[PDB]
Amino acid sequence: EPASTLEGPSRPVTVPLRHAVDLPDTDPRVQRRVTGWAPEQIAVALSAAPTSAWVSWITGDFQMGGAVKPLDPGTVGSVVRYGLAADSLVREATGDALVYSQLYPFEGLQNYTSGIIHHVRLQGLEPGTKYYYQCGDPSIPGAMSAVHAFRTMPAVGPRSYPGRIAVVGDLGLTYNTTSTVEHMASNQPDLVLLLGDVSYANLYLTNGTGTIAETYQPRWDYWGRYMEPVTSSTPMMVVEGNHEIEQQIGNKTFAAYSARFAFPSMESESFSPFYYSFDAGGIHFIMLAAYADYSKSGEQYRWLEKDLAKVDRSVTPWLVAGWHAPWYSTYKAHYREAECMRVAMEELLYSYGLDIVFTGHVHAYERSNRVFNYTLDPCGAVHISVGDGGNREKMATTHADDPGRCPEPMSTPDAFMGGFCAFNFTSGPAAGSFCWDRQPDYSAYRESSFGHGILEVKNETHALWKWHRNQDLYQGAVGDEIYIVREPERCL
Ligand SMILES: *[C@@H]1O[C@H](CO)[C@@H](O[C@@H]2O[C@H](CO)[C@@H](O[C@@H]3O[C@H](CO)[C@@H](O)[C@H](O)[C@@H]3O)[C@H](O)[C@H]2NC(C)=O)[C@H](O)[C@H]1NC(C)=O
Ligand SMILES: *[C@@H]1O[C@H](CO)[C@@H](O)[C@H](O)[C@H]1NC(C)=O
Ligand SMILES: *[C@@H]1O[C@H](CO)[C@@H](O)[C@H](O)[C@H]1NC(C)=O
Ligand SMILES: *[C@@H]1O[C@H](CO)[C@@H](O)[C@H](O)[C@H]1NC(C)=O
Ligand SMILES: *[C@@H]1O[C@H](CO)[C@@H](O)[C@H](O)[C@H]1NC(C)=O
Ligand SMILES: *[C@@H]1O[C@H](CO)[C@@H](O)[C@H](O)[C@H]1NC(C)=O
Ligand SMILES: *[C@@H]1O[C@H](CO)[C@@H](O)[C@H](O)[C@H]1NC(C)=O
Ligand SMILES: [Fe+3]
């Protein structure tokens, strides 16, 4: 039987230390495998409730370089035919289409515009049920997809859970990414959470050379094409990271992220692609924005207060959050970088009994002991960071507590969001300092390996967490495993 959080924190563990190569545009998996207006990059996303889901896809090739001419999204329809059997696609839904462009008004830089992106919401679905579907435009010969299938989340209730939820972040599109995704797919998750930093298109110049701020947007299309075997069969929920900012003409940001994925923004009443909520069985998930105003006077905070007040913990016992930047990572990389977000939101989330937090951003794996306001606390959330999806940026290997590695405080805050909130500790072992001189006691486990996690919620009190390292391929391999046990009578 696996160990558990029920008997308190564990003594910290650091796994001793042991670039990825981006997939080339010659890889058949990233090339166009369809012609004309046939769908590609097909992806399923959850709605706010299990009884609805989104199907999205792109029709038409992108344009890169020269005098790009954005496509008219009204010229290709957005239709999904679906049903309970592969030969019985008797239900129909329609949606809307859009394009986005990536434009730079500087000599020598190249412009991009997308294929036509489609988003269709299916309503009136049975929970826990396999649906077969085709997408495309039935009025254009050859413009319908093959038949695909996905399974809706189980019905919302305290003993009803998806079997496995995969959690990844900072995938990029390297050969190590393919290892992460293959490991994940072999675990047959019912749901994928992607905690920001998707394609790493901004590691390229517009002319395709791999390193104002620039991107090579075709990496998004390569990513979407590579991921389609997963996303067309498995719902995937994405939240933005800093690599999605992709600032362009007129200060426009997040164009690719906001256009490409479906989010339950309207259904969960966030009306933002950057944060939203949804239920999957008895789990209420909140995806938060580390890169949209998170201050107590802002819209995201107001939405979050409203969202939390509606959660009934007898219906959804589990309250789980995801966002890009960790609050309790002990690596030097991005150490205390999101402190202002923690200071803004942590007390609100603690007051509502947040159970688990998943993040990315730090290119390594870390699991915290239960913690609130830098204090080990039996009612604090477990913070797990899985930004180790395999992108081409350097792995995080140095720890802030390593001798001589404590960063200068003023160098740590996120420059995009601004502010400084990371003051020296005033109590505990590290009182008077910015960092510890050994692994902090709120850090249970940290390892500089690529991998993915699987969450298996069992009932209203127990969830089994497993993290799998990419370099282990044998059956049943697991790097870190623990039962996360909640105590609602104690903490709520
Ligand atoms: C919610 O799910 C958890 C996890 O499945 C339940 O706890 C688990 O309950 C089973 C059955 O009582 C325990 O199995 C027993 O484990 C011992 C070894 O520890 C073994 O010798 C027995 O033959 C038997 O297999 C299991 O240990 C226990 N696991 C943990 C971490 O507590 C829990 O009871 C469920 N709660 C509700 C309200 O349903
Ligand atoms: C890219 O688009 C911007 C805005 O329309 C324009 O200023 C620029 O000239 C374009 N660059 C090229 C090579 O077409
Ligand atoms: C990334 O993949 C390469 C090639 O398979 C492998 O040699 C390397 O060890 C992987 N890197 C990590 C940190 O696992
Ligand atoms: C892309 O632009 C950079 C910076 O000017 C340049 O160094 C590089 O050689 C260019 N790559 C190509 C394929 O033109
Ligand atoms: C772009 O951002 C700067 C501030 O960073 C601002 O001065 C400027 O007015 C903005 N331009 C537009 C079109 O919003
Ligand atoms: C967190 O700890 C600091 C210093 O002890 C304290 O000033 C602050 O009020 C605490 N924040 C809470 C309880 O939300
Ligand atoms: C905070 O701690 C660092 C060492 O981590 C130290 O250099 C610095 O002087 C401290 N700042 C204050 C105001 O105490
Ligand atoms: Fe990041």
Residue numbers in the entry: 1 to 18, 23 to 215, 228 to 508
Sentences from the study reporting this entry:
To validate our assignment of specificity pocket contents in TaPAPhy_b2, we turned to site-directed mutagenesis of predicted active site residues. Basic residues were chosen for alanine mutagenesis if they were found less than 6 Å from the predicted position of the bound substrate and were conserved in PAPhy but not in the non-phytase HMW PAPs. This process identified two residues highlighted from analysis of the MD trajectory, His229 (Pocket F) and Lys410 (pockets B and C), and one other, K348. The relative phytase activities of the mutants were <5% for H229A and 13% for K410A. On the other hand, the H229A mutant showed highly attenuated activity toward phytate. Crystallization of this mutant allowed its structure to be solved at 1.50 Å resolution, which proved it to be essentially identical to that of the wild-type enzyme. However, a region of discontinuous electron density was identified between residues Asp216 and Pro227, covering most of the PAPhy 4 motif. The lack of structural order in this region of the mutant enzyme can be explained by the deletion of a π-stacking interaction between His229 and Tyr218 following mutagenesis. Such interruption presumably results in instability of the PAPhy 4 motif, emphasizing the importance of this motif in phytate binding and recognition.
In keeping with other HMW PAPs, TAPhy_b2 consists of a smaller fibronectin type III (FN3) non-catalytic N-terminal domain (residues Pro43–Thr156) together with a larger C-terminal MPE domain (residues Arg168–Glu497). The high-resolution crystal structures of the wheat purple acid phytase isoform b2 reported herein provide a straightforward explanation by highlighting the roles of two sequence inserts (PAPhy motifs) relative to a canonical MPE domain in forming phytate-specific substrate specificity pockets.
